[PDB]
């Protein structure tokens, strides 16, 4: 929880902004591959970078979201823009990202802004993700006669 606003322009994004974070995508050894800006907002997570395409992940896809010494990372299922995989990023503020993620992910943002038409509308049936299911109960035995 926090607040504050002002009618001031921004000439550039700092390394310490309260909603943007300068990040660098890293490999299995922790070597630096490419730089970007991670944006946290009530809609979803977004990466901004060069003339390349931008990249998005909804909080629904984030089964887990972790932080370590200068390291931020997240897991995501086959349903998202990038497909199935874990993506890790070097960042001087990885704990402040982790502290802000949970503030938005607990909030759920239920239609918080007016969205366009989407395939959640009524239509023909198709392959579409299933909800949770209950654990099946145990059976009982019986006694034996003379």
């Amino acid at each position: 929880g926090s607040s504050g606003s002002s009618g001031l322009n921004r000439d550039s994004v700092p390394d310490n902004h309260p909603t943007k974070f300068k990040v660098t995508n890293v490999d299995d050894e922790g070597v630096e591959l490419g730089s970007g800006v991670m944006e946290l907002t009530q809609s979803e997570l977004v990466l901004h970078l060069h003339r390349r395409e931008a990249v998005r992940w909804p909080y629904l896809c984030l089964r887990r979201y972790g932080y370590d010494s200068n390291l931020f990372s997240f897991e995501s299922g086959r349903r998202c823009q990038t497909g199935q995989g874990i993506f890790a990023f070097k960042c001087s503020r990885a704990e402040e990202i982790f502290n802000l993620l949970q503030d938005l992910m607990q909030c759920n943002s239920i239609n918080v802004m007016e969205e366009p038409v989407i395939i959640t509308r009524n239509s023909h049936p198709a392959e579409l993700d299933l909800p949770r299911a209950p654990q099946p109960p145990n059976a009982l035995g019986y006694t034996v006669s003379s």
Partner: peptide
């Protein structure tokens, strides 16, 4: 966007329990 073999973090809060 590098795809890792496993999760690099031991301390984690599980948020969404849906696929």
């Amino acid at each position: 966007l590098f795809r890792l073999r496993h999760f690099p973090c031991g301390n984690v809060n599980y948020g969404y329990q849906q696929q």
